[PDB]
Amino acid sequence: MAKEPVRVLVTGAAGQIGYALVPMIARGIMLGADQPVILHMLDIPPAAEALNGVKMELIDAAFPLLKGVVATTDAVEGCTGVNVAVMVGGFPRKEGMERKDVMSKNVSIYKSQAAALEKHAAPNCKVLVVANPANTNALILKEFAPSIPEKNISCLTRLDHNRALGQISERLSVPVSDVKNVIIWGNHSSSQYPDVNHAKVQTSSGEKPVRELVKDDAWLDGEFISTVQQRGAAIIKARKLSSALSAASSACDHIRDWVLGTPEGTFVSMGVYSDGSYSVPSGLIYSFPVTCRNGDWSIVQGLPIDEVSRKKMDLTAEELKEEKDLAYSCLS
Amino acid sequence: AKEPVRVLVTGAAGQIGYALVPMIARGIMLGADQPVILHMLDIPPAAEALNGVKMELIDAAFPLLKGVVATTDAVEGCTGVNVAVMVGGFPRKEGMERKDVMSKNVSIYKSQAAALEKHAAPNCKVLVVANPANTNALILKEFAPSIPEKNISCLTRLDHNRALGQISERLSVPVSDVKNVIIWGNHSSSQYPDVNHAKVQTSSGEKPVRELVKDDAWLDGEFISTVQQRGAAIIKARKLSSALSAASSACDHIRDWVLGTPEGTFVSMGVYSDGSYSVPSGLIYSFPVTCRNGDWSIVQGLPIDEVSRKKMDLTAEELKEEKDLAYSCLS
Ligand SMILES: NC(=O)c1ccc[n+]([C@@H]2O[C@H](COP(=O)([O-])OP(=O)(O)OC[C@H]3O[C@@H](n4cnc5c(N)ncnc54)[C@H](O)[C@@H]3O)[C@@H](O)[C@H]2O)c1
Numbered sequence: 083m084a085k086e087p088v089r090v091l092v093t094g095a096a097g098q099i100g101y102a103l104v105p106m107i108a109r110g111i112m113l114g115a116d117q118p119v120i121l122h123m124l125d126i127p128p129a130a131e132a133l134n135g136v137k138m139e140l141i142d143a144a145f146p147l148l149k150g151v152v153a154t155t156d157a158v159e160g161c162t163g164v165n166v167a168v169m170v171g172g173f174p175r176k177e178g179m180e181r182k183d184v185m186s187k188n189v190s191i192y193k194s195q196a197a198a199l200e201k202h203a204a205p206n207c208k209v210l211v212v213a214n215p216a217n218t219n220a221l222i223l224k225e226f227a228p229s230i231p232e233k234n235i236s237c238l239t240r241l242d243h244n245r246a247l248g249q250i251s252e253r254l255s256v257p258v259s260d261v262k263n264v265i266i267w268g269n270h271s272s273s274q275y276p277d278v279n280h281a282k283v284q285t286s287s288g289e290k291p292v293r294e295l296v297k298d299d300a301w302l303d304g305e306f307i308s309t310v311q312q313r314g315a316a317i318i319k320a321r322k323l324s325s326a327l328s329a330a331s332s333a334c335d336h337i338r339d340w341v342l343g344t345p346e347g348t349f350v351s352m353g354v355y356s357d358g359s360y361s362v363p364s365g366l367i368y369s370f371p372v373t374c375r376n377g378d379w380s381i382v383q384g385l386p387i388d389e390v391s392r393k394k395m396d397l398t399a400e401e402l403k404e405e406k407d408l409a410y411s412c413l414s
Numbered sequence: 415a416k417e418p419v420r421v422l423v424t425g426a427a428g429q430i431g432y433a434l435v436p437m438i439a440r441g442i443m444l445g446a447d448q449p450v451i452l453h454m455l456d457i458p459p460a461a462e463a464l465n466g467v468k469m470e471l472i473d474a475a476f477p478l479l480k481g482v483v484a485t486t487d488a489v490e491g492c493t494g495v496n497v498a499v500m501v502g503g504f505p506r507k508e509g510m511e512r513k514d515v516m517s518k519n520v521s522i523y524k525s526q527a528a529a530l531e532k533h534a535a536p537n538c539k540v541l542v543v544a545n546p547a548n549t550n551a552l553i554l555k556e557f558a559p560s561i562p563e564k565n566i567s568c569l570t571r572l573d574h575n576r577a578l579g580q581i582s583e584r585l586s587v588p589v590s591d592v593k594n595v596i597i598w599g600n601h602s603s604s605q606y607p608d609v610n611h612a613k614v615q616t617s618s619g620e621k622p623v624r625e626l627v628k629d630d631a632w633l634d635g636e637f638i639s640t641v642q643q644r645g646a647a648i649i650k651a652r653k654l655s656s657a658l659s660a661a662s663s664a665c666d667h668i669r670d671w672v673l674g675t676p677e678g679t680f681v682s683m684g685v686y687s688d689g690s691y692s693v694p695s696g697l698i699y700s701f702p703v704t705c706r707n708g709d710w711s712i713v714q715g716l717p718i719d720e721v722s723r724k725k726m727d728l729t730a731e732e733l734k735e736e737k738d739l740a741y742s743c744l745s
C-alpha cells in the first residue's frame with residue numbers, strides 16, 4: 083500500500099460521465115486497490131452547486147483510498163499538481179448528431195485548458211481526453227501545450243475497443259474475459275476501423291482466432307463494424323443520454339493499462355500521437371494497438387495490413403486532418 | 415470461487431441502479447475474484463432505458479460479469495438469485511405527501527416479497543434501499559415469512575458512511591482513520607448518529623472521537639443535525655437524491671455482510687429487531703453489527719446514557735408510526 087497519493091483530475095466532473103467516473107477512481111479501479119488517490123474535480127460556474135453536491139457524495143461514501151477532494155471551477159486550482167488528467171469537460175451530442183457536432187462548443191475548452199495543464203500539472207502528468215470529438219480535442223490540447231511530452235497525451239478509443247469485445251462475446255456466447263486483441267484504428271467516429279484480424283478467444287482447446295470461431299466473415303466485415311461504429315448513437319436512442327457507465331469504466335481501463343501495464347499477450351487501443359507507424363501521417367491523435375509498460379505506450383508493430391485495411395486506415399487519417407482544420411476555424 | 419453469484423438489482427433503470435450495476439460488475443460488492451451474473455428488474459415504462467443499461471454493461475467488457483438478464487417480470491428477475499438489492503421505488507418529489515410516498519412504495523414490497531420467497535436461491539441475502547427503507551424492508555419481511563428473518567435488511571450504511579465523513583472532515587483526517595460510528599433506528603431524520611464508541615487512528619494510537627474533537631456541543635448538536643439532514647442537502651445541491659454514495663454504501667453493506675466486517679470494526683445495518691437494546695422486537699431497526707459467515711450479529715452491551723436512550727426510543731416510535739401508515743395503505 084503506497085503512502086504517496088496520486089492526484090487525479092476529472093474535468094466535466096458535475097456531468098454524467100464525471101458522476102459515473104469519480105467513484106470508480108475513489109474505489110481504486112483506475113490505479114489499483116493499493117493506491118490512495120486525491121481527486122481534483124473541475125467544472126464551470128453554472129454547475130458550481132451540482133459540483134459541490136458530487137463532492138458531498140464522495141465524502142459521504144467514506145472511500146478509504148480517497149485522501150482529498152478539490153471541487154472547483156478554477157482551472158489553475160484544478161490542474162495544480164495533477165498526475166493523471168481525465169478530460170471529460172464539454173457538451174455531449176444529442177440524438178441524431180455526429181460526434182463531430184460538439185466541436186464548435188468544445189475545442190475552445192481544450193485550447194484554454196492546455197495552457198492550464200502545461201503550466202500547473204505535475205511534469206509527467208498523463209492526459210486522457212474523453213470529451214468529443216475526442217481525437218481532435220486531444221490534438222488541439224497537444225498543439226497548445228507544446229511542452230507536455232507528446233507521449234503523455236491520449237484520447238479514449240477504449241470504449242470502442244470494449245464495445246467490439248462485447249460484440250464478439252455476445253455473438254459467440256463466451257465470457258468477455260476470454261476475448262482479447264481487437265483493434266480500433268483511427269478516429270473515435272464512424273470512420274474508425276474495428277479490426278478483428280488479430281483478435282483471439284480463449285477456449286478449452288487453446289487460443290483461437292475470432293474469425294475461425296465466428297465462421298461469418300461477412301458479418302465481421304459488415305454489420306459488426308457498423309454496430310460498433312454506431313453504438314454510442316444506439317445508447318442515446320435507448321437512454322436519452324449518451325454512454326456514461328461504459329465510458330467511465332473504459333476510461334478507468336485506459337489509464338489502468340497505461341500506468342500499471344498491459345497483461346502479457348494482450349494489446350489495447352489508445353488514441354496517441356502518431357509517429358509515422360503504419361504509414362499513418364505523423365502528428366495526429368490516432369488510435370493504434372499498443373502495449374504499455376513502465377508507464378509508456380508502445381505501438382504494436384509488425385501486424386499485416388491488407389488493402390482493405392490500408393484504405394480504411396487512410397480514410398480515417400484523412401478525416402482527422404479535416405477535423406483538425408475545421409477545429410482551428412472554430413477557434414479565435 | 416468459480417461459480418458466479420447471481421445478484422438481483424430492482425429499480426435497475428433508475429439513478430441508483432445506473433451507479434450500482436457497474437460497481438457490482440467490477441467486483442466491488444463481492445470481491446475482485448468473484449464472478450457475478452446480474453439480474454436487472456424494472457417496470458415496463460422504463461424497458462427501453464433498462465435495455466440501454468444492459469447494452470452498456472456489455473460495452474464495458476467487465477471480465478467478472480458472466481451474464482445480464484434485463485426484465486420487467488419480477489419472477490424472472492428473482493429466480494435463483496443469491497443477493498437481492500431492492501432499489502425499485504418512487505423517490506419523493508415536491509407535492510408528494512408522506513402518505514403518498516408510503517403508498518406508492520410499500521405496495522411494491524408486498525408484491526415482490528412473494529416472488530423472492532418462492533424463487534430466490536436458498537439463503538439469498540436481501541438489502542432494501544428504496545425509501546422508506548426500514549418500512550419497505552419490514553413489509554417485505556412480513557409478506558415473505560419463509561425467508562429467514564436474519565436475511566432481510568435495509569440500508570443505513572449511507573447514514574453510517576456520512577457520519578464517518580463528517581468526523582473525517584471536522585478533524586481533517588483521512589476517512590480511513592475513522593471507524594465505529596453507529597446509526598441507530600430509522601433511515602430518516604429521527605436517526606441517532608452516535609459517536610460514543612467511535613475511534614480515530616492518530617500518531618499516538620486509537621483515540622475516542624469525543625476525546626479528539628473536544629467539542630461535545632458540535633457532536634451532540636450540529637453533527638447530528640447534519641447527518642439527519644444530509645440527504646436533503648444532496649437534493650438541494652444536485653436537484654436529485656443521492657446515487658453515487660447510495661450505490662457505494664449498498665456495496666459496502668453487502669460486502670461486509672457476505673465477506674465479513676473488517677477486524678476491530680462494526681457497521682450499521684437495518685435488521686429485524688429481537689428486543690436487543692430495549693428497542694421493540696419485530697421492527698427493521700438499525701443496530702451496530704459485526705458480520706461473519708454471512709450473518710450479522712448485534713454488538714451488545716454498549717453503554718447507553720440517558721440522552722442516547724431517549725433518541726433511540728424516539729426513532730423506534732417513528733418506525734411504529736411508519737408501520738401503521740404502511741398498514742393503512744395496504745388495507
Ligand atoms: N468514448 C468517448 O470518448 C465518449 C463516450 C461518451 C461521451 N463522450 C463525450 O464526453 C463528454 C461528456 O459527456 P457527458 O454525458 O458527461 O456530458 P454532460 O453534459 O453530462 O457533462 C459535461 C460536463 O462538462 C462540463 N463543462 C463544460 N465546459 C467545461 C469546462 N470549460 N471545464 C470543465 N467542465 C466543463 C459541463 O458543465 C458538464 O457538467 C461529451 O463531449 C461526450 O460526447 C465521449
Ligand SMILES: NC(=O)c1ccc[n+]([C@@H]2O[C@H](COP(=O)([O-])OP(=O)(O)OC[C@H]3O[C@@H](n4cnc5c(N)ncnc54)[C@H](O)[C@@H]3O)[C@@H](O)[C@H]2O)c1
Nearest residue numbers: 425427428429430456502503505543544545547569572660
Ligand atoms: N440510503 C438509502 O436508503 C437511499 C439513498 C438514496 C435514495 N434512496 C431511495 O432509493 C430509491 C431509488 O432512488 P433513485 O434516485 O434511483 O430513483 P429512480 O426513480 O431514478 O429509480 C427508481 C427506479 O425504480 C423503478 N421501479 C418502480 N417500481 C418498480 C417495481 N415495481 N419494480 C422494479 N422497479 C421499479 C423505477 O421505474 C425507477 O427506474 C428511492 O426510493 C430513493 O428514495 C435510498
